[PDB]
Scaffold this active site. Sequence first.
Site, PDB file in Angstrom:
ATOM      1  N   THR A 182      43.685  29.106  39.421  1.00 48.38           N
ATOM      2  CA  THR A 182      42.769  29.604  38.391  1.00 48.38           C
ATOM      3  C   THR A 182      41.784  30.627  38.931  1.00 48.38           C
ATOM      4  O   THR A 182      41.457  31.577  38.229  1.00 48.38           O
ATOM      5  CB  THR A 182      42.094  28.457  37.621  1.00 48.38           C
ATOM      6  OG1 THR A 182      41.102  27.835  38.438  1.00 48.38           O
ATOM      7  CG2 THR A 182      43.086  27.453  37.109  1.00 48.38           C
ATOM      8  N   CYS A 183      41.379  30.492  40.173  1.00 46.25           N
ATOM      9  CA  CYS A 183      40.487  31.446  40.819  1.00 46.25           C
ATOM     10  C   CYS A 183      41.081  32.889  40.862  1.00 46.25           C
ATOM     11  O   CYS A 183      40.335  33.869  40.917  1.00 46.25           O
ATOM     12  CB  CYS A 183      40.118  30.948  42.216  1.00 46.25           C
ATOM     13  SG  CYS A 183      41.524  30.272  43.152  1.00 46.25           S
ATOM     14  N   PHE A 184      42.420  33.013  40.822  1.00 42.00           N
ATOM     15  CA  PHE A 184      43.068  34.333  40.868  1.00 42.00           C
ATOM     16  C   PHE A 184      43.857  34.713  39.617  1.00 42.00           C
ATOM     17  O   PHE A 184      44.498  35.772  39.611  1.00 42.00           O
ATOM     18  CB  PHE A 184      43.996  34.453  42.083  1.00 42.00           C
ATOM     19  CG  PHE A 184      43.430  33.911  43.361  1.00 42.00           C
ATOM     20  CD1 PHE A 184      42.292  34.469  43.924  1.00 42.00           C
ATOM     21  CD2 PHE A 184      44.006  32.815  43.977  1.00 42.00           C
ATOM     22  CE1 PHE A 184      41.739  33.941  45.088  1.00 42.00           C
ATOM     23  CE2 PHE A 184      43.458  32.287  45.144  1.00 42.00           C
ATOM     24  CZ  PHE A 184      42.325  32.853  45.697  1.00 42.00           C
TER      25      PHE A 184
END
EC number: 2.3.2.26
Length: 371
Positions: A345-347
Site C-alpha cells: 500500500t505504501c507504493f
Amino acid sequence: DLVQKLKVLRHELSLQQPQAGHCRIEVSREEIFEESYRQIMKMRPKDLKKRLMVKFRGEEGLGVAREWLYLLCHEMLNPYYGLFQYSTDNIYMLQINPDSSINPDHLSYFHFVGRIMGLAVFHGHYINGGFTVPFYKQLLGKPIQLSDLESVDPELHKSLVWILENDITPVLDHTFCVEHNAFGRILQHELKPNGRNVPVTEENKKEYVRLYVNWRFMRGIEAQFLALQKGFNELIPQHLLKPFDQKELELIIGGLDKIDLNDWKSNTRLKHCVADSNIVRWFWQAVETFDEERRARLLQFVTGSTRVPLQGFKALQGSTGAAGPRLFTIHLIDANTDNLPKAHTCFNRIDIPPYESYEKLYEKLLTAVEE
C-alpha cells in the site's frame, strides 16, 4: 474548474506546512480510533501542519496516512460510536447525532473528527464518508435557505414564509428569541445579542428569518457542530473556503466517488512486465468484470484507501508520505502460482505471481480483495 481553485487553496495551505519536521502518528490497527484520538488531541495545531508520518505499531518492519485515514474514517464515522448517524431522508449520507451527549466527552470527539477532516484536506488526502447537504453548507459558513427548511419543519417554514410576504406591523409581536420545548420544558433562546429586547420589525424581518432558519438547522447539534468546526478550521482556515460552494466542499473533502477506468489504466506503471504481458491483460480483463464496489475494494487493497484524488490517478500518493506521486503499479513477481497477489500500500503496487490462466488470476485476485 475545481482543480484550478483547489490548487490556489493547496498553495496557501502548503505555505503553512513547515518544511522541517514530521507529524508522527503510530497507532495499532485494532485500536486505531482511540489511539489516534489520544495522539492527535495531545498535539497543537502547528504540530499537525508538519509533513505526515503515520506508522502502524509493529507493522513498521516487514508508512501511509492514506490507509490510516481510510481505516480511521471507517471507524469514527460508524454510528456504533454515536457521533454520526445515517439520515432518515438521505439514508446514504451521515449527519451529526443529536443524542451524542450520552458520551460526556462527545464534544472532544467532534473536535477530533474535525481535526482529522482538516488534516486530510491539509495534507492532500480525502475522507471516506459522505455527509448531508446542510452539513457541507454549515461547515462552509454559508447560510441555509428558507426552502431547505420546508422538508425539516413545514409549520415553521409556513410561518417564516408568512413573515416575508406580509406586513408584520399590525399583526406580529415577535422578538429575536425563540421559545422551544427542550425535551421536558420550554426554553428561551436569543438569536442575536440581547434578542429578548429586540422586536421584529419590517426593517429587520429578513435577518430574523435567516437567523431562525439557521438556528432550527442547528437544533440539537449546536455544541457538536461548533466542536467539529473548530477542529476543521485549526487546519483549514475559514477565509480559504470562501471561493467554494456545498458541492465543491464535498469534493474537496471526499474526492471523486466514481473510479474512471481509462484514467486508472493511463496512470498505471508496470514492473517486471510490459503492456502485452498476459498478467497485465488478465488483470484489466478481471477489473472490467468487477462492479463499482469490487473496483473500490481492489483500490483499497492495493493503495490502502478507496479515495480517488480530484486530479485523478496521476496524483495517487497525496501531498505527503515519502517523495511524491507513487503511481499504481502492476508488478509481475516470480513466486508460487498458488499464492495470492500481494499488496504494498505504501507504493500502490500489486505483486502478481505468473498465473497460468485468466480464470486462475481472476479467482486469486477476487479472493485477495475479500480478505
